[PDB]
Design a protein around this ligand. Structure first.
Ligand SMILES: [Mg+2]
Ligand SMILES: [Mg+2]
Ligand SMILES: [Zn+2]
Lengths: 219, 222
């Protein structure tokens, strides 16, 4: 069967710059009769379904920006994006249609941008969760860059790491930032045995941690 | 207009059998080849096989990894496409997409469904508990406010989150589920103008297909 190899695994550029990515098949996708190369390129934005961008190696499907152009013939193909836009954050896949079908491993395209500090907000456990005997303290870290960032929870001034679940979002398609979610989970009794709750975020953007917190008895 | 909708995904044990569907409309079904493609979480697309059009005898072709294990059929009167999966395994856990395909000879446009997620494991199906995240009794910070929803303790994925039935999209961050034991927990945040909340209604709508559950939780100030 036809194997499709894509290079590089991932790319990264600032908005406006140009990128190219490679796709090679184990055999020629050029049909001697139709004079067409059965090679297509797809774009898959996060949370989305793949979208056909180009077919027959060079033809752009109606609706696709001129900034996307495909070249190559035979075994070696290339996808070029003239002026990368922020919405282009995606994994691009080539697919051969010569004999049956097969996808390449894909090329991920990340967007570089200027540094951004996270906007931090902390939320106490809801009254509803408490009745179920549990107690989650949530902390959202929104729109920061780069993705590297550390979160430290503190309860009554002392650090804590037991029941912490972290989750990073894909890069934002509008502003190229990242967001993260941190959840400190306790039982109802523990949460109520302590009084101060803190979420601390350390990011390249400052040597001083962005600090957010609350007191169980605030008013 | 041309719609491809997959269903039948969900939970299943090893060795088990599952049948997926892909209902269509907006085009004359009989004239097209149909393909099935899958994708394990965070991995590459993978073609599974296709079923040809009428003019080609509705015959089939599959990829090795599914040889003699998966079957593709089509209901030409209902315009539905199926994928019979048998003797399932962990590596089969993935999102399954149907797509309209063809001889690449006709000048066509491509369409894919949103996909259905198949999870393979022996864990039990569990509905989520949906909790509102309102700001602490403490003081605010600026003319904008961040609210949230903690979708906790469900299995398996996925769970879909919208705010005010999708009318509140801009300014919404839904975080990927995190697996802790046999349960998934995720959260979603929405930032809106202080002039909007609590002035108006802000509700997160969470759906859990595996358990056929839907929860609408209103965020009201503590
Ligand atoms: Mg493949
Ligand atoms: Mg955003
Ligand atoms: Zn304690």
């Amino acid at each position: 069967d036809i194997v499709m190899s894509q290079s590089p695994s991932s790319l990264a550029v600032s908005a406006g710059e140009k990128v190219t990515m490679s796709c090679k098949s184990s055999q020629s996708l050029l049909n001697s009769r139709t004079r067409k190369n059965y090679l297509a390129w797809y774009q898959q934005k996060p949370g989305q379904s793949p979208k056909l961008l180009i077919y027959w190696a060079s033809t752009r499907e109606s609706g696709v920006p001129d900034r996307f152009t495909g070249s190559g013939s035979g075994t070696d193909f290339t996808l070029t994006i003239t002026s990368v836009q922020a919405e282009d954050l995606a994994v691009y896949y080539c697919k051969q249609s010569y004999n049956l079908r097969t996808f390449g491993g894909g090329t991920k395209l990340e967007i570089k941008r200027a540094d951004a500090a996270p906007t931090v907000s902390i939320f106490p456990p809801s009254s509803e969760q408490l009745t179920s005997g549990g107690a989650s303290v949530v902390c959202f870290l929104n729109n920061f860059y780069p993705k590297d960032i550390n979160v430290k929870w503190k309860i009554d001034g002392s650090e804590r790491q037991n029941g912490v679940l972290n989750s990073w979002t894909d890069q934002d398609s509008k502003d190229s930032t990242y967001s993260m979610s941190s959840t400190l989970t306790l039982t109802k009794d523990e949460y109520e045995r302590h009084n101060s709750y803190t979420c601390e975020a350390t990011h390249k953007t400052s040597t001083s941690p962005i600090v957010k917190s609350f007191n169980r008895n605030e008013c | 207009e041309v719609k491809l909708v997959e269903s039948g995904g969900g939970l299943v044990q090893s060795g088990g059998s599952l049948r997926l569907s892909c209902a269509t409309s907006g085009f004359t079904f009989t004239d097209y080849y149909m393909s099935w493609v899958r994708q394990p979480p965070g991995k590459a697309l993978e073609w599974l096989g296709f079923i040809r059009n009428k003019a080609n005898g509705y015959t089939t072709e599959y990829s090795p990894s599914v040889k003699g294990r998966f079957t593709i059929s089509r209901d030409n009167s209902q315009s539905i496409l199926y994928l019979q999966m048998n003797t399932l395994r962990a590596e089969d856990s993935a999102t399954y997409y149907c797509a309209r395909d063809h001889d690449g000879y006709y000048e066509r446009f491509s369409y894919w469904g949103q996909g259905t997620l198949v999870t393979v494991s022996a864990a039990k199906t569990t509905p989520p508990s949906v909790y509102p995240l309102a700001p602490g009794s403490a003081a605010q910070t600026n003319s904008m406010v961040t609210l949230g929803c903690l979708v906790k303790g469900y299995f398996p994925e996925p769970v879909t989150v919208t705010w005010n039935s999708g009318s509140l999209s801009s300014g919404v961050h839904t975080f990927p589920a995190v697996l802790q034991s046999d349960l998934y927990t995720l959260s979603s945040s929405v930032t809106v103008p202080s002039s909007t909340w609590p002035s108006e209604t802000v509700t997160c709508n969470v759906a859990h297909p595996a358990s056929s559950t839907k929860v609408d939780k209103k965020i009201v100030p503590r």
